Amino acid sequence: RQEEIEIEVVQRKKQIAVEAQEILRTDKELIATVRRPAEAEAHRIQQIAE
Amino acid sequence: RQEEIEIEVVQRKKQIAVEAQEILRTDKELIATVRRPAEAEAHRIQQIAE
Amino acid sequence: VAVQEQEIARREKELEARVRKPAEAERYKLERLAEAEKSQLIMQAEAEAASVR
């Protein structure tokens, strides 16, 4: 059982490296889904205001 | 799986070049559907006003 | 991550054609259509004024 529970430990040890890529993925995803679309929506206003 | 997900990467790499032509297409399309028709509609007014 | 690092360059082109270009076309339409509305109202004003005098 010491060796069996160690399987869970190495899984967590790797899951940490998975979530490290998840942050980076979520960051780029927010640039494409939030930051850039909002910047486009703001330009419409500056044009239709004229 | 590193090679499989690379297929999606090269697809995106090309999709960028597709949308680059899409901007240019949409630009010319707006000249024919909006800018020129509006310029014609404005001339009617200047004539029927006389 | 590499796939979404290209999705950025994608939206940056899609939004230019979907969001920016048509809003810019609408601005030009509104401006040249406004000149026509003004032109008709000044000509009509002159007609009503002449008809009164």
From Swiss-Prot, chain C:
It comes from the Eukaryota. It is found in: Cell membrane; Endosome; Membrane, Caveola; Melanosome. May act as a scaffolding protein within caveolar membranes, functionally participating in formation of caveolae or caveolae-like vesicles. Heterooligomeric complex of flotillin-1 and flotillin-2 and caveolin-1 and caveolin-2. Interacts with ECPAS. Belongs to the band 7/mec-2 family. Flotillin subfamily. This is Flotillin-1. The gene is FLOT1.
